[PDB]
Amino acid sequence: MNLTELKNTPVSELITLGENMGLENLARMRKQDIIFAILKQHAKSGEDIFGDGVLEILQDGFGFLRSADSSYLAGPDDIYVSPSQIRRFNLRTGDTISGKIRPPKEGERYFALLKVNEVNFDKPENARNKILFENLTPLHANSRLRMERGNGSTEDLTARVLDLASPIGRGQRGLIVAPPKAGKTMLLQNIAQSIAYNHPDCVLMVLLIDERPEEVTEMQRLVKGEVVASTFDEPASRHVQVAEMVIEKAKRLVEHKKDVIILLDSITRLARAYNTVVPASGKVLTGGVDANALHRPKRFFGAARNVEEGGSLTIIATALIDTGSKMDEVIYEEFKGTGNMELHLSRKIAEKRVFPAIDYNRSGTRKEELLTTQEELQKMWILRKIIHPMGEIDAMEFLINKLAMTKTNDDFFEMMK
Amino acid sequence: MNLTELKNTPVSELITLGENMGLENLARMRKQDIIFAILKQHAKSGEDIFGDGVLEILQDGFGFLRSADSSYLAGPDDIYVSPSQIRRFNLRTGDTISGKIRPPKEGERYFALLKVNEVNFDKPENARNKILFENLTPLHANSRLRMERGNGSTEDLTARVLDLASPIGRGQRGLIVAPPKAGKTMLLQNIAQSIAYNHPDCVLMVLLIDERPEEVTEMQRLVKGEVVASTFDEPASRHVQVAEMVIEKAKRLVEHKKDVIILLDSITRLARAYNTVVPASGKVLTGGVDANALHRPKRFFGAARNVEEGGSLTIIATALIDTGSKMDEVIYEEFKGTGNMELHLSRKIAEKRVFPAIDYNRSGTRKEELLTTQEELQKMWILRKIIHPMGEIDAMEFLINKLAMTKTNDDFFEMMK
Amino acid sequence: RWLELGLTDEEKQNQLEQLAEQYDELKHEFEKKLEAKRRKITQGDDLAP
Numbered sequence: 070m071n072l073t074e075l076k077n078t079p080v081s082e083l084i085t086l087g088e089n090m091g092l093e094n095l096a097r098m099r100k101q102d103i104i105f106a107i108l109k110q111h112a113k114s115g116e117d118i119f120g121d122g123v124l125e126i127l128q129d130g131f132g133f134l135r136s137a138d139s140s141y142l143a144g145p146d147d148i149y150v151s152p153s154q155i156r157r158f159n160l161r162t163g164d165t166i167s168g169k170i171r172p173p174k175e176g177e178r179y180f181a182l183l184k185v186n187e188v189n190f191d192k193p194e195n196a197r198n199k200i201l202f203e204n205l206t207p208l209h210a211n212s213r214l215r216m217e218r219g220n221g222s223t224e225d226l227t228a229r230v231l232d233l234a235s236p237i238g239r240g241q242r243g244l245i246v247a248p249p250k251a252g253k254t255m256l257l258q259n260i261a262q263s264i265a266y267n268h269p270d271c272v273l274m275v276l277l278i279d280e281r282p283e284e285v286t287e288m289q290r291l292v293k294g295e296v297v298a299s300t301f302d303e304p305a306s307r308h309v310q311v312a313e314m315v316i317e318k319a320k321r322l323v324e325h326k327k328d329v330i331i332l333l334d335s336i337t338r339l340a341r342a343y344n345t346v347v348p349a350s351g352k353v354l355t356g357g358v359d360a361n362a363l364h365r366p367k368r369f370f371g372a373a374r375n376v377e378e379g380g381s382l383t384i385i386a387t388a389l390i391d392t393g394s395k396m397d398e399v400i401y402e403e404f405k406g407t408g409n410m411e412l413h414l415s416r417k418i419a420e421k422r423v424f425p426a427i428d429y430n431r432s433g434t435r436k437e438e439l440l441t442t443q444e445e446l447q448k449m450w451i452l453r454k455i456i457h458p459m460g461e462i463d464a465m466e467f468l469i470n471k472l473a474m475t476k477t478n479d480d481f482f483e484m485m486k
Numbered sequence: 487m488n489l490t491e492l493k494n495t496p497v498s499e500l501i502t503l504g505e506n507m508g509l510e511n512l513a514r515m516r517k518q519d520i521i522f523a524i525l526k527q528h529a530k531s532g533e534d535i536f537g538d539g540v541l542e543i544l545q546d547g548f549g550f551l552r553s554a555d556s557s558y559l560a561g562p563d564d565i566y567v568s569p570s571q572i573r574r575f576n577l578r579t580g581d582t583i584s585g586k587i588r589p590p591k592e593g594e595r596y597f598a599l600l601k602v603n604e605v606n607f608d609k610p611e612n613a614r615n616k617i618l619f620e621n622l623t624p625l626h627a628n629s630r631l632r633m634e635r636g637n638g639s640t641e642d643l644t645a646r647v648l649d650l651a652s653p654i655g656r657g658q659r660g661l662i663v664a665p666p667k668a669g670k671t672m673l674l675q676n677i678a679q680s681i682a683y684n685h686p687d688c689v690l691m692v693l694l695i696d697e698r699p700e701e702v703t704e705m706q707r708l709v710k711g712e713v714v715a716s717t718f719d720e721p722a723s724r725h726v727q728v729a730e731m732v733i734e735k736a737k738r739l740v741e742h743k744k745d746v747i748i749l750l751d752s753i754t755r756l757a758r759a760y761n762t763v764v765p766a767s768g769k770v771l772t773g774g775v776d777a778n779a780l781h782r783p784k785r786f787f788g789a790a791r792n793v794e795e796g797g798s799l800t801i802i803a804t805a806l807i808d809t810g811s812k813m814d815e816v817i818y819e820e821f822k823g824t825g826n827m828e829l830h831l832s833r834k835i836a837e838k839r840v841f842p843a844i845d846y847n848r849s850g851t852r853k854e855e856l857l858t859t860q861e862e863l864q865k866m867w868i869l870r871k872i873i874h875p876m877g878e879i880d881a882m883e884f885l886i887n888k889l890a891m892t893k894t895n896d897d898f899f900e901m902m903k
Numbered sequence: 904r905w906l907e908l909g910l911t912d913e914e915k916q917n918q919l920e921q922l923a924e925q926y927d928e929l930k931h932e933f934e935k936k937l938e939a940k941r942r943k944i945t946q947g948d949d950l951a952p
């Protein structure tokens with residue numbers, strides 16, 4: 070029996086199945102131990118059990134295989150793995166494992182793994198002959214990501230603006246600078262829809278840290294991807310745990326020659342969690358910030374790169390400004406000269422209800438010559454020269470108003486002449 | 487005999503009844519043990535006894551049923567419940583129980599429960615087949631709360647301003663940012679009166695933490711609701727106890743498909759109580775704050791949501807600023823990007839005696855499109871555009887002066903054109 | 904473990920409730936005797952000044 074099958078089931082179907090099995094009232098307790106108990110029963114009377122998830126190594130040597138629907142949380146759903154696997158197949162933190170499991174025997178409460186069927190959607194034999202992550206040779210953005218769908222709906226134009234404001238490719242670092250109440254949420258939503266529609270081949274992951282559960286719920290069932298998130302009713306331990314697990318999963322997946330693109334919103338809340346979870350090293354900055362509290366966020370942001378040997382990792386993290394604290398400014402200043410794809414969203418345009426509010430003049434992308442052709446980049450330069458002397462609001466006014474009538478971006482370039 | 491009957495009686499009537507019974511002088515001691523002793527007598531010679539309250543589970547397995555008029559406090563008024571009930575009906579922390587009780591026998595001092603008559607105003611059979619709280623599917627605000635009464639008295643206009651400044655619906659999170667001496671007390675009072683007058687179907691609860699007893703007294707007998715509060719002459723244990731009990735009661739009640747709306751003033755004092763009651767975890771923030779001291783307040787604030795399956799939970803917590811401490815700013819900064827309904831009360835307008843002092847420019851509500859019609863929200867946008875370029879004081883001056891003559895809000899929208 | 908059911912409430916559930924109440928009283932009395940014997944055999948003895 071597969072675990073992900075009972076995973077994609079709602080709680081009501083689990084309740085109905087447990088009542089069909091004729092047991093103690095299972096609807097009373099957690100979905101976690103609901104699945105645990107129904108699995109224990111169906112495995113008392115049932116086949117080999119099958120399961121899948123992502124592995125995290127403990128300091129005891131053993132490992133835990135956890136689910137992304139539980140956002141990689143500790144509980145009875147986890148699969149225990151022995152260090153003997155981590156010696157035989159030499160398992161690692163963040164490996165996508167899928168294999169056979171069994172009930173725990175006398176005194177045990179965690180399902181034990183039997184035989185690894187797929188390691189990162191690949192062969193264990195081929196799991197040995199792999200390349201290390203930092204041992205790779207990074208490179209600039211080589212292949213551009215097509216965000217324009219070509220239909221021109223009410224929201225798709227938003228993505229089109231990006232296609233002429235800051236082109237993104239596999240291996241690029243994107244950083245969004247926006248104050249609160251600027252419309253970045255559905256900005257990432259439309260971006261994710263477009264990159265999932267245009268490229269169903271690259272595995273797409275999003276990250277929500279200290280976000281409201283409403284957006285988490287509406288996102289985890291609207292776009293494609295293992296939509297993993299971290300709500301604010303948990304301490305910084307869980308947030309940094311999601312950070313570790315998904316960043317290691319992306320690292321292993323690009324090591325397996327796959328293009329991974331990670332959507333984070335926001336990087337400032339994650340860095341604040343990093344600060345409040347890391348022990349104090351004596352050196353305080355302005356606003357209660359540790360110098361070592363930015364080391365791991367810098368690692369998380371710089372993990373993205375464009376591999377020469379194969380695969381790529383592109384990160385798009387959003388940053389908050391203009392919200393008053395000391396940490397927001399110190400973090401945004403520390404991260405300004407890090408990413409090579411700035412996207413500035415000025416609230417001065419969002420206050421006029423002109424969406425998307427994009428600061429085209431203060432935005433840009435370095436090494437953008439390796440993403441578009443000569444005439445494409447030339448048209449981009451000419452339009453930037455045309456719109457730069459204009460202000461902010463009127464700039465986006467002209468951009469959106471002229472992209473409203475024409476429907477393909479190259480046609481917009483043509484008509485702009 | 488019902489307990490709530492003797493509960494709603496003043497102390498003088500209890501004294502008269504005890505003297506009519508011909509016993510030792512009962513007026514000498516607590517209302518608590520006054521009711522205890524008169525119940526012991528009337529139950530020595532009387533029917534089955536009846537009682538009602540909210541249940542809290544102890545770490546011994548048993549539970550205590552307490553009263554909200556005593557703000558869920560420990561004392562002789564409590565009803566002892568055995569773990570056998572918590573196995574049979576599987577009782578829970580925060581269940582509204584009402585059932586039959588008896589005097590305690592030899593050596594016992596707590597009234598024992600006999601048979602549960604109503605569990606959360608519902609059937610115990612139907613108390614099994616229920617849905618778990620976090621297992622629910624949250625959603626955005628779907629149904630808007632009508633705060634306008636339509637009479638236009640001296641204070642009702644205050645609520646009307648909210649109806650055009652930040653619309654609230656079932657499941658929304660409201661956070662009030664106001665310095666001391668800004669008129670938030672009767673702001674919540676008028677809001678509670680309006681939502682109790684317009685919607686007598688949803689159970690309405692308020693929360694006062696570290697508040698003066700005068701406001702507690704004047705509130706517990708002016709509006710409808712189980713007005714539970716926590717005065718500062720008790721330590722943080724009692725305050726966090728009220729927090730637990732009423733939040734669990736609201737959770738169970740929305741689990742029973744009921745709309746619960748919780749009024750808290752203020753969230754900063756409750757968070758300070760949480761900080762001073764939680765043990766230190768080593769990590770200190772600016773101002774003696776624990777990182778884990780905000781975890782449970784964040785849980786309390788994020789518990790509110792709009793359920794898809796049925797019922798809803800809306801929280802309106804007030805926050806204090808500009809009072810000098812480190813905790814107030816760190817807490818308000820931590821809670822800024824949490825709530826989706828900001829209400830800013832600037833003291834700069836309250837100093838001019840212009841009530842209500844509402845920062846309309848710095849206030850707003852996300853996902854406000856799911857609460858009003860197209861033309862309503864359009865008129866809201868046009869008026870926001872009209873009043874935004876104005877200052878603060880003059881903005882509220884114009885708002886209040888133009889809402890003074892017209893009496894219905896849509897008529898105000900019409901006349902504003 | 905399933906003393907509790909439901910059918911023809913008006914009198915059947917009344918008798919079942921009377922029985923459940925008697926059972927709860929019996930369990931409470933047994934727990935009282937248990938704790939009494941416990942505190943009796945575990946109380947601090949007096950030996951000498």
Ligand SMILES: Nc1ncnc2c1ncn2[C@@H]1O[C@H](COP(=O)(O)OP(=O)(O)O)[C@@H](O)[C@H]1O
Nearest residue numbers: 224249250251252253254255424852853854855
């Ligand atoms: N493409 C759009 N069309 C219409 N309205 C929009 C569009 N984008 C944003 N909005 C408006 O902006 C608001 C966005 O709210 P929110 O997602 O909280 O903004 P942010 O994510 O920037 O904080 C909504 O109330 C919506 O009415």
Ligand SMILES: Nc1ncnc2c1ncn2[C@@H]1O[C@H](COP(=O)(O)OP(=O)(O)O)[C@@H](O)[C@H]1O
Nearest residue numbers: 640641644665666667668669670671672673841
């Ligand atoms: N709607 C109103 N109607 C009449 N008086 C009001 C109103 N709102 C505020 N006030 C005045 O403001 C004062 C409120 O004090 P208080 O409730 O302690 O404010 P805060 O809680 O902000 O310190 C009262 O003396 C009252 O005269």
Ligand code: BEF
Nearest residue numbers: 248249250251252
């Ligand atoms: F989601 Be908003 F930008 F706070």
Ligand code: BEF
Nearest residue numbers: 665666667668669
């Ligand atoms: F209640 Be006041 F604002 F001190």
Ligand SMILES: [Mg+2]
Nearest residue numbers: 250252253254
């Ligand atoms: Mg947003």
Ligand SMILES: [Mg+2]
Nearest residue numbers: 667669670671
């Ligand atoms: Mg006050």
